[PDB]
mmCIF file of N, CA and C in Angstrom:
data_model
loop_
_atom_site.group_PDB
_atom_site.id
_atom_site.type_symbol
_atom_site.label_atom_id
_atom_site.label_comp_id
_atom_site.label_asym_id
_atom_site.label_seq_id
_atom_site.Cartn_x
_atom_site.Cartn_y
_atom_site.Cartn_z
ATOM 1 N N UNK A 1 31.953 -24.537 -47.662
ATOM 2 C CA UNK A 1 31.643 -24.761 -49.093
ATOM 3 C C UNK A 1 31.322 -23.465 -49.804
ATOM 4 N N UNK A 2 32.118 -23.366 -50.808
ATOM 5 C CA UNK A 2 31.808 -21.898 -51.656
ATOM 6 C C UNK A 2 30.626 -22.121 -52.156
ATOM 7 N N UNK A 3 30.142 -23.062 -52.785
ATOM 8 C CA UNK A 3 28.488 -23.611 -54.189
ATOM 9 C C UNK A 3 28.797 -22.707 -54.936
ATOM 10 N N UNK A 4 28.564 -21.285 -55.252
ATOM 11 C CA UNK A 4 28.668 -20.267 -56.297
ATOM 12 C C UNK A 4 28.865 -19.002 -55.590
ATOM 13 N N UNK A 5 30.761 -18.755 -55.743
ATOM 14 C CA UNK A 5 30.884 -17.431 -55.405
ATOM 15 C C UNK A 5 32.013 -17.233 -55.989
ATOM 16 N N UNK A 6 33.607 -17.904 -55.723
ATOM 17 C CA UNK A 6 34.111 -17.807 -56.159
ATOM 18 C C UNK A 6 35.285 -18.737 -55.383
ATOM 19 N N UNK A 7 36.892 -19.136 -56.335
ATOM 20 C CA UNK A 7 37.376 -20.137 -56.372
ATOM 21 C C UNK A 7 38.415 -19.351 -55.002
ATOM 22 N N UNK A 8 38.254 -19.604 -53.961
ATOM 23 C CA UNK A 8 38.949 -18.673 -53.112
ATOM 24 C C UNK A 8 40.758 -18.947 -53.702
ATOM 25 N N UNK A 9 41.181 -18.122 -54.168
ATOM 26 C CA UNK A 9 42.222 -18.165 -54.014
ATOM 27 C C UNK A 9 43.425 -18.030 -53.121
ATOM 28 N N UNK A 10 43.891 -18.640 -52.052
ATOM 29 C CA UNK A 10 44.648 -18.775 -51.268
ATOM 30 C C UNK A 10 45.611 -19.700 -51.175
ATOM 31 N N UNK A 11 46.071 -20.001 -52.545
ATOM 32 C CA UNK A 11 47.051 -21.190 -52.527
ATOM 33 C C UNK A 11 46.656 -22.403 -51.954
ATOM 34 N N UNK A 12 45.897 -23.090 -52.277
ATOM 35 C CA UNK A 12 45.803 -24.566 -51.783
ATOM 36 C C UNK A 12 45.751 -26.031 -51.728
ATOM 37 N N UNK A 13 46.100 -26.594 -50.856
ATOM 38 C CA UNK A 13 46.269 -28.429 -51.379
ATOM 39 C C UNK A 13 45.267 -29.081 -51.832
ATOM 40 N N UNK A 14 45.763 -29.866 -53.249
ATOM 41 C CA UNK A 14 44.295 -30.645 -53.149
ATOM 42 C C UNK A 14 44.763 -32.233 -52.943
ATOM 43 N N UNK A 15 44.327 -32.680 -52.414
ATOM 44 C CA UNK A 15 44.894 -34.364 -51.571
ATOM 45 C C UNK A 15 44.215 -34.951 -52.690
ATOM 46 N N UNK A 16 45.193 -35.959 -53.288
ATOM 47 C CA UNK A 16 45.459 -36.987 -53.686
ATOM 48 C C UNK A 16 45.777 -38.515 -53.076
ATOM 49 N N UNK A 17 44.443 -38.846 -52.710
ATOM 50 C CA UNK A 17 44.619 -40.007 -51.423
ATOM 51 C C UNK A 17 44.693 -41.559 -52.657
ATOM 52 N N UNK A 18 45.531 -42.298 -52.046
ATOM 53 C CA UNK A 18 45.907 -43.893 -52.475
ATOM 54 C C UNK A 18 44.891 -44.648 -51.898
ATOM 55 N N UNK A 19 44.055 -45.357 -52.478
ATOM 56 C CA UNK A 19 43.803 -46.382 -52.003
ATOM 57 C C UNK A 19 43.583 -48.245 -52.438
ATOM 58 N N UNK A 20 42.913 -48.773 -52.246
ATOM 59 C CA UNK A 20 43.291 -50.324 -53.058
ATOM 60 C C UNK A 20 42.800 -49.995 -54.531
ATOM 61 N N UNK A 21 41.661 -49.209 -54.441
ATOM 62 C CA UNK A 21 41.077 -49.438 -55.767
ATOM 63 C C UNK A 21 41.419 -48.401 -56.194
ATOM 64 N N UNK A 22 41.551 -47.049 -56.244
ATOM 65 C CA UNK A 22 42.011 -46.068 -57.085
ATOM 66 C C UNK A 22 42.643 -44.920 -56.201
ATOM 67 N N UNK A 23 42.105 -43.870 -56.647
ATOM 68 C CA UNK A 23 43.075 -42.735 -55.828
ATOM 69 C C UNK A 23 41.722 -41.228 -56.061
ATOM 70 N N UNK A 24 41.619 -40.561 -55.356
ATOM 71 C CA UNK A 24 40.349 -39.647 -54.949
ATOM 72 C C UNK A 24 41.039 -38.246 -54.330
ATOM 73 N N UNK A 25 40.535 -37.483 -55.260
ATOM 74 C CA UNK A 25 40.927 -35.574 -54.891
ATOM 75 C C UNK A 25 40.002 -35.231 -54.325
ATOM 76 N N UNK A 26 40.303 -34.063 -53.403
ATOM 77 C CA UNK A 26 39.578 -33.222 -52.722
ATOM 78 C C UNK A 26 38.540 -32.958 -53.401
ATOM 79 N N UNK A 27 38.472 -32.470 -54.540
ATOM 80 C CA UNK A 27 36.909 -32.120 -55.418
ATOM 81 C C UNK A 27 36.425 -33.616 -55.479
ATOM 82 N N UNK A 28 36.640 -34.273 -55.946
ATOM 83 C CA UNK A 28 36.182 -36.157 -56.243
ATOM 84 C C UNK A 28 36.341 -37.383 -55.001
ATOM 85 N N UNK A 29 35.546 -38.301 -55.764
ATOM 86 C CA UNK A 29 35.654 -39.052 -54.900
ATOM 87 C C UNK A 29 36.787 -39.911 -55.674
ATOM 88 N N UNK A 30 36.667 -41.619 -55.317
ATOM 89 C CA UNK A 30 37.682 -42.647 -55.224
ATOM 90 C C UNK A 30 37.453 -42.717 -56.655
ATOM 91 N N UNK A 31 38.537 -43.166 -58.050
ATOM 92 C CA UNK A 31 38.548 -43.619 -58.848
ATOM 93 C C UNK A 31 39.547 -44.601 -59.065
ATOM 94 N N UNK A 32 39.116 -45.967 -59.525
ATOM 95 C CA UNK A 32 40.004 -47.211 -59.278
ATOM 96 C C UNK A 32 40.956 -46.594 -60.576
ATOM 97 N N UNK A 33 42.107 -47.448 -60.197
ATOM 98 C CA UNK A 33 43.712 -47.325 -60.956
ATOM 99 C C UNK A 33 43.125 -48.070 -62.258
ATOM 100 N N UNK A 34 42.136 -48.137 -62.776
ATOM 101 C CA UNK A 34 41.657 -49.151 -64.157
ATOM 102 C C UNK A 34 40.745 -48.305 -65.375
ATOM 103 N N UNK A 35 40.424 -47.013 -64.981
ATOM 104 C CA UNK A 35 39.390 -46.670 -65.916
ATOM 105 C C UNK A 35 40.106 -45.871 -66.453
ATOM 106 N N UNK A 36 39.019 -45.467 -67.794
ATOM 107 C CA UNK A 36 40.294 -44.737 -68.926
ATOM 108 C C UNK A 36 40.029 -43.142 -68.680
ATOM 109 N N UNK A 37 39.083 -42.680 -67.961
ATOM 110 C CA UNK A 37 38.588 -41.613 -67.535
ATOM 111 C C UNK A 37 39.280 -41.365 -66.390
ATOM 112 N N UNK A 38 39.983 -41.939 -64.981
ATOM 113 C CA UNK A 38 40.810 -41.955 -64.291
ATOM 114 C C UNK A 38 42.214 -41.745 -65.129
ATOM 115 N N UNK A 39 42.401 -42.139 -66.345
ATOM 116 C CA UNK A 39 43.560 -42.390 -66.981
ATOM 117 C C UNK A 39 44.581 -40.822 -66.891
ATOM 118 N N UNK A 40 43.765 -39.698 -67.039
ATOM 119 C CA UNK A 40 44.371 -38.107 -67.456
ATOM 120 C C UNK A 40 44.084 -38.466 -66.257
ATOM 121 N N UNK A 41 44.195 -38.168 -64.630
ATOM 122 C CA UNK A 41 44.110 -37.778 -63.562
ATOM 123 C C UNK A 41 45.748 -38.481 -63.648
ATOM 124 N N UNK A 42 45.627 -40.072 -63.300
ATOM 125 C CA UNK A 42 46.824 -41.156 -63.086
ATOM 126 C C UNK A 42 48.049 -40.325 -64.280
ATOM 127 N N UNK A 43 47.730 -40.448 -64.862
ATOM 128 C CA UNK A 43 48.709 -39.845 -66.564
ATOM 129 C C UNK A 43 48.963 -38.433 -66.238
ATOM 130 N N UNK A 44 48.321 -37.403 -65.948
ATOM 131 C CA UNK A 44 49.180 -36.104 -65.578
ATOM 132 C C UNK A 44 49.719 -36.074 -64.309
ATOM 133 N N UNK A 45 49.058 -36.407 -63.051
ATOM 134 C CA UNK A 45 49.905 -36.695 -61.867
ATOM 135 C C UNK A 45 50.836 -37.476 -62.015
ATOM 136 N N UNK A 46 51.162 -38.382 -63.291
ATOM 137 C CA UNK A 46 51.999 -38.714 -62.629
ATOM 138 C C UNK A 46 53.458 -38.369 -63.086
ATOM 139 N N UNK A 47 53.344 -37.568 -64.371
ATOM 140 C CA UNK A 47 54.378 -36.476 -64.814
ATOM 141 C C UNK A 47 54.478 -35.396 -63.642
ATOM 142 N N UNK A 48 53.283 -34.627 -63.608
ATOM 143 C CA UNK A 48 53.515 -33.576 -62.683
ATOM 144 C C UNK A 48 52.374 -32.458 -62.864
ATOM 145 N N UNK A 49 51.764 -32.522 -64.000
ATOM 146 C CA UNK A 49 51.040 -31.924 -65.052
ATOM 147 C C UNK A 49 49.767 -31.619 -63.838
ATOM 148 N N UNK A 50 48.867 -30.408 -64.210
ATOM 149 C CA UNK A 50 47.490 -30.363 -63.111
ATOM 150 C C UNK A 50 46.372 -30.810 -63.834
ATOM 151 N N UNK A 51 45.309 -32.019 -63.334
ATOM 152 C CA UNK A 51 44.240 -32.269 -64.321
ATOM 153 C C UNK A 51 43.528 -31.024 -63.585
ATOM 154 N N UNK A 52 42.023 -30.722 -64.628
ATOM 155 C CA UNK A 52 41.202 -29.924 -64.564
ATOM 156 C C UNK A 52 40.596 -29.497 -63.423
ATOM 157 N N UNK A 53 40.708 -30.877 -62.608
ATOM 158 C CA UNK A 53 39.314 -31.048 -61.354
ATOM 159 C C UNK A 53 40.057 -30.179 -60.139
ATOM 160 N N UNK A 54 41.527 -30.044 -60.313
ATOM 161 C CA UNK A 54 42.116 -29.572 -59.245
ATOM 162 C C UNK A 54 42.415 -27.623 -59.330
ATOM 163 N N UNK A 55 42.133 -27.573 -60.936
ATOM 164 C CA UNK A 55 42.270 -26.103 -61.024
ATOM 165 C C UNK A 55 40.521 -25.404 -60.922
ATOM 166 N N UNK A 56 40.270 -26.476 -61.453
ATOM 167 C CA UNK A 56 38.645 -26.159 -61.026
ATOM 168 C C UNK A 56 38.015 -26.570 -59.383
ATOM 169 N N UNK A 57 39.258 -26.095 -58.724
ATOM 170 C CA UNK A 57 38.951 -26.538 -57.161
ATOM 171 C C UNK A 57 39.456 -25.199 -56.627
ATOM 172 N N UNK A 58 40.478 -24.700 -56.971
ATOM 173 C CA UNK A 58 41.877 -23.762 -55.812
ATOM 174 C C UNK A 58 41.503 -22.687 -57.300
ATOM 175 N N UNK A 59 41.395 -21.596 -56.809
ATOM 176 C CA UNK A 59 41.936 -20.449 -58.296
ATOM 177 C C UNK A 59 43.023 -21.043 -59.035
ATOM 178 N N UNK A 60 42.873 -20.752 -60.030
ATOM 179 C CA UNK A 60 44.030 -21.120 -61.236
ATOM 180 C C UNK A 60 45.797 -20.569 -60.329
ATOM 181 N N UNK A 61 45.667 -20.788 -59.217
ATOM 182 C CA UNK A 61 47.084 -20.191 -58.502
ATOM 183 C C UNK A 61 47.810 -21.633 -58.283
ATOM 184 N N UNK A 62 48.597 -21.432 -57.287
ATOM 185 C CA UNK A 62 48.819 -22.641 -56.513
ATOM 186 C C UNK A 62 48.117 -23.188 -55.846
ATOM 187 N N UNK A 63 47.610 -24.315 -57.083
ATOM 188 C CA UNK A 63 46.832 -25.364 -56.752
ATOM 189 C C UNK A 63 48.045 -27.152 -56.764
ATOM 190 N N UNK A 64 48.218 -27.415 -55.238
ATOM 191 C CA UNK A 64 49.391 -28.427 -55.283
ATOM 192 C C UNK A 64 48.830 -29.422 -54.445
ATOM 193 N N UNK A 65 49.303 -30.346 -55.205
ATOM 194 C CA UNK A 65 48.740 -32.398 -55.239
ATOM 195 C C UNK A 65 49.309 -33.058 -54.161
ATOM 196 N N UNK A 66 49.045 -32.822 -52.665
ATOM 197 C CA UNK A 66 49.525 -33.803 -51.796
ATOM 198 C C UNK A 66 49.063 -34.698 -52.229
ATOM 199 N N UNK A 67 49.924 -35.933 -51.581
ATOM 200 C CA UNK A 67 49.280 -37.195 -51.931
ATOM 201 C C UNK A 67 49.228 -38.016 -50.210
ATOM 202 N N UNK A 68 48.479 -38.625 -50.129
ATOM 203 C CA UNK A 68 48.488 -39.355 -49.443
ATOM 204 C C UNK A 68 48.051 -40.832 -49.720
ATOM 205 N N UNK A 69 48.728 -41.823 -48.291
ATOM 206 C CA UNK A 69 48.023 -43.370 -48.562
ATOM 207 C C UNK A 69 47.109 -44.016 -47.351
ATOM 208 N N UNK A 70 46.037 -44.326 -47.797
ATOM 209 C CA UNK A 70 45.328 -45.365 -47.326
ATOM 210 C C UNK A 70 44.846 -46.982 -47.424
ATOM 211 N N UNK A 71 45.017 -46.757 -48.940
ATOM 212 C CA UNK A 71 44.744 -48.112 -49.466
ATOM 213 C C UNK A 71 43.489 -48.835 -49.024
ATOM 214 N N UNK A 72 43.557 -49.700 -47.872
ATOM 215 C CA UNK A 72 42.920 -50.827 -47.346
ATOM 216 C C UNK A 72 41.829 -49.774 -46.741
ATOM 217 N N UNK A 73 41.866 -48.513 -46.749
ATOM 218 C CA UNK A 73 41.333 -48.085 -45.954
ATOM 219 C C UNK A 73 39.547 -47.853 -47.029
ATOM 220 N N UNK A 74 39.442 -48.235 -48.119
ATOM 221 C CA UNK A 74 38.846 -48.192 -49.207
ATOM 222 C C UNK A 74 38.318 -46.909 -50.115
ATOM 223 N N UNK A 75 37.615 -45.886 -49.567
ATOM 224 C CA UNK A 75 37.806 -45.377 -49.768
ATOM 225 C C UNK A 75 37.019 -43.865 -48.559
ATOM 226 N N UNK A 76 37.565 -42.961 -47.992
ATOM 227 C CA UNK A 76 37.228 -41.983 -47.260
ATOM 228 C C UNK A 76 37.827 -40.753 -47.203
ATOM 229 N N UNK A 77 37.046 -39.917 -48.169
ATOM 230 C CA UNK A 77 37.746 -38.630 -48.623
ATOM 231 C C UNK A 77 36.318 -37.406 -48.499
ATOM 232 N N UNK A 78 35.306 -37.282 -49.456
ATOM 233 C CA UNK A 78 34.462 -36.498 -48.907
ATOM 234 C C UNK A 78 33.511 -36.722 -47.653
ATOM 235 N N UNK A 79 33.704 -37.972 -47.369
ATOM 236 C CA UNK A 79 32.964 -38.597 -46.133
ATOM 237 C C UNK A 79 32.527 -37.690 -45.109
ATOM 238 N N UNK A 80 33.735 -37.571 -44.958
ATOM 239 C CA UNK A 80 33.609 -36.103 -43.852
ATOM 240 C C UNK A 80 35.118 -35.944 -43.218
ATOM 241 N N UNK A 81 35.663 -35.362 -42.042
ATOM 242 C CA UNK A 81 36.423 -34.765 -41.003
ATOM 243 C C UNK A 81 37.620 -34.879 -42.150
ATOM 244 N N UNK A 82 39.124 -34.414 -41.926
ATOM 245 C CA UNK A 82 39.870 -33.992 -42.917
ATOM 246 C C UNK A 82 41.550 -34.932 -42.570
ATOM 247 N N UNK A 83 41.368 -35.119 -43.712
ATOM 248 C CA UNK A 83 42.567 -35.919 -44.384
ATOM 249 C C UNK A 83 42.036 -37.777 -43.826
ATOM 250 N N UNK A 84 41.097 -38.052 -43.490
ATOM 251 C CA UNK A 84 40.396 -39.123 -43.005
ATOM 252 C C UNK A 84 41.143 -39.844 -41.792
ATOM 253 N N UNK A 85 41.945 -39.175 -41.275
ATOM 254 C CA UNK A 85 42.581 -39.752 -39.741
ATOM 255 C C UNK A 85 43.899 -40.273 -40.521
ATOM 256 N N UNK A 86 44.721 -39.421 -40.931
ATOM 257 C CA UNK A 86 46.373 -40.509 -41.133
ATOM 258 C C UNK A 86 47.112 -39.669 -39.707
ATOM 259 N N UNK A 87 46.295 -39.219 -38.849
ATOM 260 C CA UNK A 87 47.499 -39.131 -37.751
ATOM 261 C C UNK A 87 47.827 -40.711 -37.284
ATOM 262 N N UNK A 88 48.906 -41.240 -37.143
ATOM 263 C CA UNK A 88 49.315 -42.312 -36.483
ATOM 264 C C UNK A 88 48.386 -42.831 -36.065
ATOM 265 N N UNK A 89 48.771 -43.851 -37.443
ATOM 266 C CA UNK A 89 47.627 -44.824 -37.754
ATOM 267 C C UNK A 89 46.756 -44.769 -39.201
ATOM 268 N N UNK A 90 45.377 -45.293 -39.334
ATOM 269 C CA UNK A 90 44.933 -44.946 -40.425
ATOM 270 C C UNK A 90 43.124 -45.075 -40.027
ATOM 271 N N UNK A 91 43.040 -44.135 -39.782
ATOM 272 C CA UNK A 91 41.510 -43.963 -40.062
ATOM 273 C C UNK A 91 41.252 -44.162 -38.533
ATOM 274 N N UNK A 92 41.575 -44.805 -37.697
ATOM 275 C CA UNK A 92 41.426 -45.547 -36.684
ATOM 276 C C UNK A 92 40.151 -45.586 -35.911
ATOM 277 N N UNK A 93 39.228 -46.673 -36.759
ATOM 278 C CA UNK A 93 37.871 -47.092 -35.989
ATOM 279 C C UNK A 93 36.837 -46.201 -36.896
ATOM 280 N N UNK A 94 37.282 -44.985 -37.467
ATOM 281 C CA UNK A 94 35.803 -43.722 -37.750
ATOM 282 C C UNK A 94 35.049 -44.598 -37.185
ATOM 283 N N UNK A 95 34.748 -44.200 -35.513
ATOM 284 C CA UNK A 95 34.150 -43.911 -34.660
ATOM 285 C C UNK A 95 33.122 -42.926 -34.602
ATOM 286 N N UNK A 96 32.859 -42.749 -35.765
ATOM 287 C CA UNK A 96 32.345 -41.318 -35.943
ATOM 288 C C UNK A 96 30.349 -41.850 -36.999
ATOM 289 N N UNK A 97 29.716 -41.730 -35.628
ATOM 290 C CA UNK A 97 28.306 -42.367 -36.255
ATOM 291 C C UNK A 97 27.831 -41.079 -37.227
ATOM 292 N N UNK A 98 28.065 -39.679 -37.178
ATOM 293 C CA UNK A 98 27.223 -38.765 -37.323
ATOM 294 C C UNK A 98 28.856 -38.210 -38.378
ATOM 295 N N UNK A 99 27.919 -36.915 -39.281
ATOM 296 C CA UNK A 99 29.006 -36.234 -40.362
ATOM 297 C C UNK A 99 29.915 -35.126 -39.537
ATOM 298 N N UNK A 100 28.551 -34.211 -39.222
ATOM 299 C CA UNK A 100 29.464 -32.981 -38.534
ATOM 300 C C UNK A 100 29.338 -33.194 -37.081
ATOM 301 N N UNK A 101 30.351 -32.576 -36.456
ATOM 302 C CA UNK A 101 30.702 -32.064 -34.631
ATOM 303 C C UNK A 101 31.621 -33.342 -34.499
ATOM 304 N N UNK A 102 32.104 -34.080 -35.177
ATOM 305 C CA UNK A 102 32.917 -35.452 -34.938
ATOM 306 C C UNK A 102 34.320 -34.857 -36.422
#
């Protein structure tokens, strides 16, 4: 975690995860597909356009919108461990009682 230093610039992804109720970036959490404040996130992704939260994440460089899906999985993005388990499968069990060393 940077907190206050600076936006490392190294070109990087910011995940755009699917789920039942909305869809959640690396800086944010889950926002359902219904609010009008979700609306510019849903509405520029889905031209192509970068909302704020993602340039205010990566230096103003290449900052680029994987997306991924979970859906059912509800929602698990800052939770902890990374990309929330889509290796084959989805999530499978977070087995995981504790944040970090898992």
């Amino acid at each position: 975690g940077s907190e206050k230093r600076q936006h490392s610039s190294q070109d990087v992804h910011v995940v755009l995860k699917l789920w039942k109720s909305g869809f959640s970036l690396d800086n944010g959490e889950l926002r359902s597909y219904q609010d009008p404040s979700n609306a510019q996130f849903l509405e520029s992704i889905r031209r192509g356009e970068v909302p704020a939260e993602l340039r205010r994440l990566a230096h103003g460089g290449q900052v680029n919108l994987d997306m991924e899906d979970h859906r059912d999985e509800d929602f698990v993005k800052p939770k902890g461990a990374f990309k929330a388990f889509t290796g084959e499968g989805q999530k499978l069990g977070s087995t995981a009682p504790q944040v970090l060393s898992t």
